[PDB]
RNA sequence: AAGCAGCUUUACAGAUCAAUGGCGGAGGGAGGUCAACAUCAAGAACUGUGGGCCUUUUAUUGCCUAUAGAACUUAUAACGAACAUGGUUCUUGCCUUUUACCAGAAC
């Protein structure tokens, strides 16, 4: 087994490094979705309970989304439909109309966060 | 517009009483505070069908063109010359808390 593993060489990638540094949430950032049709914005949930969407390119913030009263722990665009779900520690799952920037769909029963 | 000739013919009477074609007949009408199914808000916005058309063979759909038929609804835009309630979110009001609510919006 050793043998077979050290003769192999692995693939090179280039390293990373740090580009921009965005600040303007209030809490921790929880969760990140990129826009998983055109790549032109990003998501992020926050322990400060907001979402907020930021244009990709310049790093601003295009706005912000108000729907739960506890930390939101994931977000997920959906790349089928015009829709934004997202989760909380308040114990909702909430679909949002990208269409309009507005919930329209709750989902209930889940017992915790 | 009536008197006469042409069209229509029918209550009839014929040649014909054969060979034809025309229009009907081979399960009636009016109703029901009966039922089921289909359909009713959209490029002013409809479906079938003949020929041509991108999907690599245009199929059944979307496009061009020819043509027959469109019931209901609608422009001081809606089936309803009528008019209720509820959910979510936002902003208000009353407000000691929730229900029940104040009244505007959006979906
Ligand atoms: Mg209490």
Same mark, same amino acid.
């Given at each position: 087994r050793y043998e077979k593993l050290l003769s192999? $060489?692995?693939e090179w990638h280039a390293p990373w490094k740090l580009?921009?540094?965005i600040n303007?949430?209030?809490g921790w950032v929880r969760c990140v979705a990129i826009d998983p049709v055109d790549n032109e914005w990003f998501i992020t949930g926050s322990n400060d309970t907001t979402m907020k969407v930021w244009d990709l390119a310049t790093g601003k913030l295009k706005t912000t989304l108000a729907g739960h009263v506890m930390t939101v722990r994931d977000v997920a665009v959906s790349? $089928?439909?015009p829709y934004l779900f997202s989760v909380s520690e308040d114990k909702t799952v909430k679909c949002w109309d990208l269409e309009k920037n507005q919930i329209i769909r709750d989902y209930y029963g889940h017992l915790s966060g």
């Open positions: 192999q $060489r692995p580009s921009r540094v303007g949430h209030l790349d $089928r439909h």
